[PDB]
PDB file of C-alpha atoms and ligand atoms in Angstrom:
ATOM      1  CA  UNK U 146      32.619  -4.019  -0.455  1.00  0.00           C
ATOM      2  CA  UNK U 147      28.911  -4.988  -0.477  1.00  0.00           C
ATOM      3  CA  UNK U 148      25.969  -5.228  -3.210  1.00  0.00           C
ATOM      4  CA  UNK U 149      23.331  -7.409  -1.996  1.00  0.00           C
ATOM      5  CA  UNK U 150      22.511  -7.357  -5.160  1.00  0.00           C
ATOM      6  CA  UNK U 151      19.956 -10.182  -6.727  1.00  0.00           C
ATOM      7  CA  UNK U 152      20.681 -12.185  -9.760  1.00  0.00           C
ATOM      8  CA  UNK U 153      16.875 -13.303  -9.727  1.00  0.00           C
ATOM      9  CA  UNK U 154      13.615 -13.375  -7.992  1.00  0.00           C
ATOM     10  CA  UNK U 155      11.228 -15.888  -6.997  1.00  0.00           C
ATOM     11  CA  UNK U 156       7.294 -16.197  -6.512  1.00  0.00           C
ATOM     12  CA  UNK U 157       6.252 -17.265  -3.071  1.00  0.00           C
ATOM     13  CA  UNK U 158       3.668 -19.892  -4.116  1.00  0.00           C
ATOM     14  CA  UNK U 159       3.121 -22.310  -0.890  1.00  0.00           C
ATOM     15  CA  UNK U 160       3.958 -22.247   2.540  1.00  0.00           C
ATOM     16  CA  UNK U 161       4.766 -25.400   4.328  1.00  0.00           C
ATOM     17  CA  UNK U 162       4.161 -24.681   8.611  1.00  0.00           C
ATOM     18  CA  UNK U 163       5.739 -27.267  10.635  1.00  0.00           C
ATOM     19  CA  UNK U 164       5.078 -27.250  14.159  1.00  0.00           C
ATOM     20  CA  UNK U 165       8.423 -27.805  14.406  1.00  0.00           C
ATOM     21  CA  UNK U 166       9.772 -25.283  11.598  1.00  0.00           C
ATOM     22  CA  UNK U 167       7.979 -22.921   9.292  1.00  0.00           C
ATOM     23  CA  UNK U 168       9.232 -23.705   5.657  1.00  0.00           C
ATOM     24  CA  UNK U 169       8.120 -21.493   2.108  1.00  0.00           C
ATOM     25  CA  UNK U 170       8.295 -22.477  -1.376  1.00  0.00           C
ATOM     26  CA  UNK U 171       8.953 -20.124  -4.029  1.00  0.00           C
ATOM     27  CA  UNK U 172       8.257 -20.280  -8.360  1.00  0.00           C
ATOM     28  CA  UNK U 173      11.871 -20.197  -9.954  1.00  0.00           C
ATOM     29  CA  UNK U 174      12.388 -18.438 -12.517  1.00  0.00           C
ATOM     30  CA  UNK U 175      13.943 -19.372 -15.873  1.00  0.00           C
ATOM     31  CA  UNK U 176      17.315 -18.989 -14.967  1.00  0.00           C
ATOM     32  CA  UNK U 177      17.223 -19.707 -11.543  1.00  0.00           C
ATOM     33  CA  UNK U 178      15.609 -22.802 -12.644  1.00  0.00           C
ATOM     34  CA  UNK U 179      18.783 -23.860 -14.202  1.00  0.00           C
ATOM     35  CA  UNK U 180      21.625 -24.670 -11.968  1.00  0.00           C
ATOM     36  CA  UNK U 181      19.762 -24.373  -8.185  1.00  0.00           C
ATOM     37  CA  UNK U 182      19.735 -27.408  -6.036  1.00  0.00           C
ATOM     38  CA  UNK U 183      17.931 -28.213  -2.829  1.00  0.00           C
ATOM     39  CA  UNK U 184      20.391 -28.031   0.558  1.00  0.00           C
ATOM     40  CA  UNK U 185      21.692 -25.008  -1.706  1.00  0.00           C
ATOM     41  CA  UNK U 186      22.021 -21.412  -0.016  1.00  0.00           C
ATOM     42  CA  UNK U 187      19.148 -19.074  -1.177  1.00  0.00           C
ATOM     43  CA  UNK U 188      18.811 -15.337  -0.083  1.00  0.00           C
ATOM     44  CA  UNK U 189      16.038 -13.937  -0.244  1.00  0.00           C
ATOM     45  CA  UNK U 190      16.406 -10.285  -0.724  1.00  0.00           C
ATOM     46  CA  UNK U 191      19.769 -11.379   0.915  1.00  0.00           C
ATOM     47  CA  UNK U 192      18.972 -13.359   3.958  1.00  0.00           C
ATOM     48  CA  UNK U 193      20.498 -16.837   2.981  1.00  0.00           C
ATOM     49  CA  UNK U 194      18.509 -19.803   4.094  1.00  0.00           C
ATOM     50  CA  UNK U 195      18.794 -23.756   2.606  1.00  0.00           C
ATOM     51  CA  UNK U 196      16.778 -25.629   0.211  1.00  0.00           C
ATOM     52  CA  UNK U 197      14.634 -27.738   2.126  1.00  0.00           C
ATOM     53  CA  UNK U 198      12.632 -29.472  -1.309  1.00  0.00           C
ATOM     54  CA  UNK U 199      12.750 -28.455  -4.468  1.00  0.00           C
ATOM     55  CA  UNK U 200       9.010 -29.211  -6.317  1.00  0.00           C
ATOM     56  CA  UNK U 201       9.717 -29.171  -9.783  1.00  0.00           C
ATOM     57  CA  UNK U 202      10.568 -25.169 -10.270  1.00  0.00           C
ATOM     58  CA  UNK U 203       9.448 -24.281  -7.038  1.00  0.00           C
ATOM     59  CA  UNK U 204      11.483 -24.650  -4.266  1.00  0.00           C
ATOM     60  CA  UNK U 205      10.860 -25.206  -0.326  1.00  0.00           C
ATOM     61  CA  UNK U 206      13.407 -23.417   2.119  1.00  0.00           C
ATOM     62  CA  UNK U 207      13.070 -23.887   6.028  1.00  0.00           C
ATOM     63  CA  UNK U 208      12.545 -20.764   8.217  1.00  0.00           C
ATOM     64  CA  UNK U 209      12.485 -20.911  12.116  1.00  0.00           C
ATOM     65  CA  UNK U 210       9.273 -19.010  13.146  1.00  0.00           C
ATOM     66  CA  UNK U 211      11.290 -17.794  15.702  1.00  0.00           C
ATOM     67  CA  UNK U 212      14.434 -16.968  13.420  1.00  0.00           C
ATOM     68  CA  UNK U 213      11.149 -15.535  10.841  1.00  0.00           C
ATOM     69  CA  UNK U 214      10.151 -12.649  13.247  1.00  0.00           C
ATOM     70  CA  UNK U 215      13.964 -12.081  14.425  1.00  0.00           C
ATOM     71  CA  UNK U 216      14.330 -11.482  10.893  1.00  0.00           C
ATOM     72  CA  UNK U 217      12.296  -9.759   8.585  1.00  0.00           C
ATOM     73  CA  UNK U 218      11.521 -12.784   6.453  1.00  0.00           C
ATOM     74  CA  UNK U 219       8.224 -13.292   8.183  1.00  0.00           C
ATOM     75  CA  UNK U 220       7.122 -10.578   5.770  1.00  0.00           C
ATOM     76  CA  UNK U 221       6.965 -12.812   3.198  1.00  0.00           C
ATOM     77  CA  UNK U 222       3.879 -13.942   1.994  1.00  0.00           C
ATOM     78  CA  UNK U 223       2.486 -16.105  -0.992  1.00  0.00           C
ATOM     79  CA  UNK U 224       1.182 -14.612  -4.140  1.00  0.00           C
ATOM     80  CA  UNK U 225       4.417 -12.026  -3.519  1.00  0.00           C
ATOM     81  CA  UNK U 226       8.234 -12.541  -5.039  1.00  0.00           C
ATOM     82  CA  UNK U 227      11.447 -12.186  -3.408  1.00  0.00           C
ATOM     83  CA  UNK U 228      14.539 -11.252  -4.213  1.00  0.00           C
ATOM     84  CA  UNK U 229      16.666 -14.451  -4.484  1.00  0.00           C
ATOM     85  CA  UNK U 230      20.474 -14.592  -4.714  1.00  0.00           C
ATOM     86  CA  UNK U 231      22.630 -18.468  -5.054  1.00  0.00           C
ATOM     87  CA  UNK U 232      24.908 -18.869  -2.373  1.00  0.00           C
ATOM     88  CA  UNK U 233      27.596 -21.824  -2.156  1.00  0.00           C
ATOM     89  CA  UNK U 234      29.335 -23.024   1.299  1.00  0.00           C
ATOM     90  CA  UNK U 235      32.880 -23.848  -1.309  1.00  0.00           C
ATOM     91  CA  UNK U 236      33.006 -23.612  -4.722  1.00  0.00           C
ATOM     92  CA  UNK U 237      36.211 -24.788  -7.270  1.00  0.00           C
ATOM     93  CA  UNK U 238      36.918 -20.988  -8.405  1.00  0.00           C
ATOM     94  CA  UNK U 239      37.602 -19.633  -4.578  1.00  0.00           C
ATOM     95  CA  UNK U 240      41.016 -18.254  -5.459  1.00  0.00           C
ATOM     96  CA  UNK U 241      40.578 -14.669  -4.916  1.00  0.00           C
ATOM     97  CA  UNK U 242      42.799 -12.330  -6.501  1.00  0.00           C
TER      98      UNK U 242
ATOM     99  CA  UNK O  93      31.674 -16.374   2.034  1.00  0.00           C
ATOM    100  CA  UNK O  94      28.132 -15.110   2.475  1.00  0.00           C
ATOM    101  CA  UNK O  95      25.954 -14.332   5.216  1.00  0.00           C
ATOM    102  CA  UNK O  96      23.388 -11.669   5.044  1.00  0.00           C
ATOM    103  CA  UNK O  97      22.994 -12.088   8.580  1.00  0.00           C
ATOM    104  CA  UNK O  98      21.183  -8.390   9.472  1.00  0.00           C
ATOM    105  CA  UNK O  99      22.367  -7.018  12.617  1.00  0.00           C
ATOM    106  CA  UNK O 100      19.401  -5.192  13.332  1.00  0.00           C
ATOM    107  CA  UNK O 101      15.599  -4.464  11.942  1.00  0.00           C
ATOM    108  CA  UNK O 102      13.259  -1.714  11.181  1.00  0.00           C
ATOM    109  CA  UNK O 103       9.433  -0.618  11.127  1.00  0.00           C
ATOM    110  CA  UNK O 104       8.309   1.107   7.973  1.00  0.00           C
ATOM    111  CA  UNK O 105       6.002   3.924   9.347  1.00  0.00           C
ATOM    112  CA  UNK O 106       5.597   5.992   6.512  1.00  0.00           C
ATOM    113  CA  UNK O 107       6.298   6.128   2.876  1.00  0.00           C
ATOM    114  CA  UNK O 108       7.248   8.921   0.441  1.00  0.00           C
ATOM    115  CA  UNK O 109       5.725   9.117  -3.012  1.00  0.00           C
ATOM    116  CA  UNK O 110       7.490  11.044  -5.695  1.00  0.00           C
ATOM    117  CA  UNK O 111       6.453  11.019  -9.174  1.00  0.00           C
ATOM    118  CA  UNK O 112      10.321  11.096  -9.910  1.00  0.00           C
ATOM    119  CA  UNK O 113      11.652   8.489  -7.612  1.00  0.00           C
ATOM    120  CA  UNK O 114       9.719   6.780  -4.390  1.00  0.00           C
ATOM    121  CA  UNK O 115      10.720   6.894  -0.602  1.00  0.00           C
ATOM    122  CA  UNK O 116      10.118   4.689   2.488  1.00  0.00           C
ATOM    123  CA  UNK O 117      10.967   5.472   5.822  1.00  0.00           C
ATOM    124  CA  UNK O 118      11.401   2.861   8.658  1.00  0.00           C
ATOM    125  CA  UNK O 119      11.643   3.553  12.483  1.00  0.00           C
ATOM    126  CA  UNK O 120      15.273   2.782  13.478  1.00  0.00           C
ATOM    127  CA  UNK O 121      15.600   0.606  16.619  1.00  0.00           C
ATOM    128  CA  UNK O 122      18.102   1.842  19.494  1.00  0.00           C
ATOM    129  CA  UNK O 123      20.975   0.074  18.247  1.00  0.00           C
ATOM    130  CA  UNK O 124      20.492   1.423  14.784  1.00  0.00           C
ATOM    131  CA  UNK O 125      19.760   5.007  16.029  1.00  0.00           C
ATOM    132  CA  UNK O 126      23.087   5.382  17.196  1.00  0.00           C
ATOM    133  CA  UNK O 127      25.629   5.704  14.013  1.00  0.00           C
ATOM    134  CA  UNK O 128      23.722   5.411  11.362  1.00  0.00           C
ATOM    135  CA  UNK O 129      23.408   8.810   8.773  1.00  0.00           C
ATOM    136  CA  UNK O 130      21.953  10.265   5.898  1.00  0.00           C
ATOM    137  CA  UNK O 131      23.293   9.247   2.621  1.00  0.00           C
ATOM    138  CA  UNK O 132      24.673   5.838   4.537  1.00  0.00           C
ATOM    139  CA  UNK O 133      23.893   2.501   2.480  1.00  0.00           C
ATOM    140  CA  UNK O 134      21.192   0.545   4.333  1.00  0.00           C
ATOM    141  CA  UNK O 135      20.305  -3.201   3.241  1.00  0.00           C
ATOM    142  CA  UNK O 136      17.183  -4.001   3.492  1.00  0.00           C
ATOM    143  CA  UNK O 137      17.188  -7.658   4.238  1.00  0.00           C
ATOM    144  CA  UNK O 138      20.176  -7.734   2.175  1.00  0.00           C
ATOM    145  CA  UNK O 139      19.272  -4.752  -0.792  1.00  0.00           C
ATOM    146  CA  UNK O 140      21.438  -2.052  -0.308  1.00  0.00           C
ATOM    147  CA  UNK O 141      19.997   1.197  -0.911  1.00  0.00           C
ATOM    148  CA  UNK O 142      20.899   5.256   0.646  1.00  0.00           C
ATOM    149  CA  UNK O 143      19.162   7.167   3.215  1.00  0.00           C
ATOM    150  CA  UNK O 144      17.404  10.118   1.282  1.00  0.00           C
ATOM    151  CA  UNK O 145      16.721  11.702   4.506  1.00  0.00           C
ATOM    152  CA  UNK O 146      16.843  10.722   8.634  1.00  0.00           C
ATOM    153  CA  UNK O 147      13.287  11.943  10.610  1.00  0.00           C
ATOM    154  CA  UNK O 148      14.650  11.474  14.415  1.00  0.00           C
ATOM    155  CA  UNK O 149      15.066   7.968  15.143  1.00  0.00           C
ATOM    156  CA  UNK O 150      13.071   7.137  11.031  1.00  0.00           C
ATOM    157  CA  UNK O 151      15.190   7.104   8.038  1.00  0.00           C
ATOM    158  CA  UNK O 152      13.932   7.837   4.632  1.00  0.00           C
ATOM    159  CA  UNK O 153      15.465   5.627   2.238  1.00  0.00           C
ATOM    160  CA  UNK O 154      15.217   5.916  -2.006  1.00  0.00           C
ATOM    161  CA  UNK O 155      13.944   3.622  -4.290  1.00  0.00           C
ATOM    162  CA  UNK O 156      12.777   3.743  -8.181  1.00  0.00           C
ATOM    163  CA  UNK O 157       9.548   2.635  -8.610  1.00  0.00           C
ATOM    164  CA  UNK O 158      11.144   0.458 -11.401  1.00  0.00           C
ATOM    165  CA  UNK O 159      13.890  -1.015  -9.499  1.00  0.00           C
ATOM    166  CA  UNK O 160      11.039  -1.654  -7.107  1.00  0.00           C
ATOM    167  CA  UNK O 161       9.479  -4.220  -9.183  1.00  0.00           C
ATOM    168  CA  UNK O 162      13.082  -5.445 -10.621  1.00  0.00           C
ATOM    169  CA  UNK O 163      14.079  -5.852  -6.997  1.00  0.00           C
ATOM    170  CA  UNK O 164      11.527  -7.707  -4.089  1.00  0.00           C
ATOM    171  CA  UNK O 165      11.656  -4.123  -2.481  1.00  0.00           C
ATOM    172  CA  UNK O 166       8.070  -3.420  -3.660  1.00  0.00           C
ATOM    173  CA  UNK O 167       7.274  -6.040  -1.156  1.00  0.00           C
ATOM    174  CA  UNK O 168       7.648  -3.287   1.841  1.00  0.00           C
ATOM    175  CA  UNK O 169       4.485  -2.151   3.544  1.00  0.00           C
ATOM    176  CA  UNK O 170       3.774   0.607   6.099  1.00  0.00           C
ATOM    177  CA  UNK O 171       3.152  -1.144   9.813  1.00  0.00           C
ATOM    178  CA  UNK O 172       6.177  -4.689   8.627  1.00  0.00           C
ATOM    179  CA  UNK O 173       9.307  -4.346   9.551  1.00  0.00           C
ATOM    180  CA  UNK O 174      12.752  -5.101   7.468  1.00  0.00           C
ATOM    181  CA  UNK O 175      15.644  -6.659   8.169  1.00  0.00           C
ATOM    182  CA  UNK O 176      18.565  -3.589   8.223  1.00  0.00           C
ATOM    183  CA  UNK O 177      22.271  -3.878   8.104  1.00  0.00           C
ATOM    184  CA  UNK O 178      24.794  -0.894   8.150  1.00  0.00           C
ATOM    185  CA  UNK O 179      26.934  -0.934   4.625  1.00  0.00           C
ATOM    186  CA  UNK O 180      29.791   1.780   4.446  1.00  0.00           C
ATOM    187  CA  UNK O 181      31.749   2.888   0.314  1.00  0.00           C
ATOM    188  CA  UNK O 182      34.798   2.654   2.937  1.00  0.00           C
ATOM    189  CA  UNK O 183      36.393   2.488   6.297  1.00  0.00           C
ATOM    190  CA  UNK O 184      39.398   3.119   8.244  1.00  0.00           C
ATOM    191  CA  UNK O 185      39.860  -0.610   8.873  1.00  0.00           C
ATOM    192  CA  UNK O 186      37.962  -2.682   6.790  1.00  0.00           C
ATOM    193  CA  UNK O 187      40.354  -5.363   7.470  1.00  0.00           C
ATOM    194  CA  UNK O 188      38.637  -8.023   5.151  1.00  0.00           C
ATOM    195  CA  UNK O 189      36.357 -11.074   5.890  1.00  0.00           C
TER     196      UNK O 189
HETATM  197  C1  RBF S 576      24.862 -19.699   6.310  1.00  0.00           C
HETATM  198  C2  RBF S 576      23.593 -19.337   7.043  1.00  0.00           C
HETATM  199  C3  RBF S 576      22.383 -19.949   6.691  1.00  0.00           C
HETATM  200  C4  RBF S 576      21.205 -19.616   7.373  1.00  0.00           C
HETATM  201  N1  RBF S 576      20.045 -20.207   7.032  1.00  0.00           N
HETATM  202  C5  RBF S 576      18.886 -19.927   7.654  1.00  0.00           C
HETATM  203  C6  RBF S 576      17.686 -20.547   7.284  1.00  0.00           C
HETATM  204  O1  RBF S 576      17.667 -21.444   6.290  1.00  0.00           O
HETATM  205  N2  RBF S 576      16.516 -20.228   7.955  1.00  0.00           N
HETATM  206  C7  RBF S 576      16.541 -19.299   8.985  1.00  0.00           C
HETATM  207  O2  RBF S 576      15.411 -18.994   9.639  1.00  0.00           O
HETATM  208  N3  RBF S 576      17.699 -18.704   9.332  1.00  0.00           N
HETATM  209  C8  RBF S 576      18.858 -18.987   8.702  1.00  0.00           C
HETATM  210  N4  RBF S 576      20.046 -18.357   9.079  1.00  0.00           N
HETATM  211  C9  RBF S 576      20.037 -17.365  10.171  1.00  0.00           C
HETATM  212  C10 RBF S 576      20.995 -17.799  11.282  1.00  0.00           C
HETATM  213  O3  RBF S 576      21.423 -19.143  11.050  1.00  0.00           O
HETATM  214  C11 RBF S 576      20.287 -17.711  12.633  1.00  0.00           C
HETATM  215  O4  RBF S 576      18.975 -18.270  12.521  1.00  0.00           O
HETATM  216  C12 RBF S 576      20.184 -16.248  13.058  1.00  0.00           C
HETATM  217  O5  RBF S 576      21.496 -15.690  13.166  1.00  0.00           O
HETATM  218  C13 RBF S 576      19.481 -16.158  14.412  1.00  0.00           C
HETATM  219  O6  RBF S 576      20.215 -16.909  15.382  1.00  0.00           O
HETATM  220  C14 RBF S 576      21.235 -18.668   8.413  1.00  0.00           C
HETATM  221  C15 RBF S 576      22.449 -18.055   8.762  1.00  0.00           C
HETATM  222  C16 RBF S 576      23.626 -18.390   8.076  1.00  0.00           C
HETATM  223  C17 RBF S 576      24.933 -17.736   8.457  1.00  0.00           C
HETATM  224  C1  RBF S 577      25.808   0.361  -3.796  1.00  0.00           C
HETATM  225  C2  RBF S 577      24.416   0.211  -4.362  1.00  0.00           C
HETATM  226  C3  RBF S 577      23.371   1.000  -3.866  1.00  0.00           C
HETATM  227  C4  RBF S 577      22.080   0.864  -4.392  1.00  0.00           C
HETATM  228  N1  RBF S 577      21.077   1.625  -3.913  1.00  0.00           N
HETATM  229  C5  RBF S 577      19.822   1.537  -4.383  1.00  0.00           C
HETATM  230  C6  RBF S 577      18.790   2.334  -3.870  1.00  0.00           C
HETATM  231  O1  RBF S 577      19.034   3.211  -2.889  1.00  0.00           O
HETATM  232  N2  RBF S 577      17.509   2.210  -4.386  1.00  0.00           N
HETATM  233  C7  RBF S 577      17.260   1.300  -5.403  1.00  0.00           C
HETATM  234  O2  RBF S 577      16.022   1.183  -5.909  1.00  0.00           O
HETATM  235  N3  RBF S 577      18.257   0.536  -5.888  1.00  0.00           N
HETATM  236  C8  RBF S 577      19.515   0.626  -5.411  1.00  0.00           C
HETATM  237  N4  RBF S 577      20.533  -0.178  -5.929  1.00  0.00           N
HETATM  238  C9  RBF S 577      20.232  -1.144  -7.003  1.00  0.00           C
HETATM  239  C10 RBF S 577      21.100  -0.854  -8.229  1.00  0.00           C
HETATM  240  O3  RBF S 577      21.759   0.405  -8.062  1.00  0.00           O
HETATM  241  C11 RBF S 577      20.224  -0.812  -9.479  1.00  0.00           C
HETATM  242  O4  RBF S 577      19.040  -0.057  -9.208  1.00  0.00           O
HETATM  243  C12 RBF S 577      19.840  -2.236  -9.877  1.00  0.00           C
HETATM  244  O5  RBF S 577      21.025  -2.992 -10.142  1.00  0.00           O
HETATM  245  C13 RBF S 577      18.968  -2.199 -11.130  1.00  0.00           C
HETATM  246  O6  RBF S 577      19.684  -1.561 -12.191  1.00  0.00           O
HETATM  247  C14 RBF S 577      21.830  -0.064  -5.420  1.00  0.00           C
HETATM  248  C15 RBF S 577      22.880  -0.856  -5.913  1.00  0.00           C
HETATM  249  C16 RBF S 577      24.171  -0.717  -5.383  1.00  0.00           C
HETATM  250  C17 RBF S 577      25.301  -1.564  -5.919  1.00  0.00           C
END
């Protein structure tokens, strides 16, 4: 089984560059707005990363620059939108089946 | 469980424009080149789409101009690269993870 499929997308908006990690903040839309948190799992097109901030409706996520060229989220770039998926480390409804 | 982890990337060299339904084709690195086919299910960064068409070592991929915008595919440009990931309908041992 696999989808990748995106429940939402987001609007690149700022980049935060940290000498010692490269982090990007994205616009969230209306019902991505509701219900994300920061530390929270985001995918982006369907490469999860964490919530480093949230500003409001934006929302920072940290990116190696490193980890950004091994994977192809050093494409991103502000003014553009991404693909962005919630992911959860545990969650009360796990029972499968 | 979630990951998107890609196991490998590729370079978008050229892209195909139909009126109908659009194309891009990416240059697929050595350890994509072996195994992957025509009409396979690549994720792009996590969006799984199918291979219209292999060029060599490139693979043509389809995507609806409309689904482009609905998904962050648009965001592909000739000369980037993408995060790929083999996705298979099924398997002789899937096994489950
Ligand atoms: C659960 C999970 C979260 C990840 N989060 C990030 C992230 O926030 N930023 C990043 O550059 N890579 C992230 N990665 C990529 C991964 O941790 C690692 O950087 C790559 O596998 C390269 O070693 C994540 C991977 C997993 C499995
Ligand atoms: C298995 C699978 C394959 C998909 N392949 C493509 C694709 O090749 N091109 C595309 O634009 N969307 C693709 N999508 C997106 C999906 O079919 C549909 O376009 C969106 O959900 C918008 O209706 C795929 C979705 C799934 C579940």
């Amino acid at each position: 089984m696999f989808t990748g499929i995106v429940q939402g997308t987001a609007k690149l908006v700022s980049i935060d560059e940290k000498p010692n990690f490269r982090t990007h903040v994205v616009e969230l839309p209306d019902h991505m707005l509701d219900g994300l948190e920061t530390g929270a799992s985001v995918a982006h097109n369907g490469c999860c990363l964490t919530v480093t901030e949230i500003n409001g409706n934006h929302v920072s996520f940290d990116l190696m620059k490193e980890t950004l060229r091994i994977t192809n989220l050093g494409d991103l770039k502000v003014g553009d939108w991404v693909n962005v998926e919630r992911a959860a480390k545990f969650s009360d409804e796990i029972g499968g089946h």
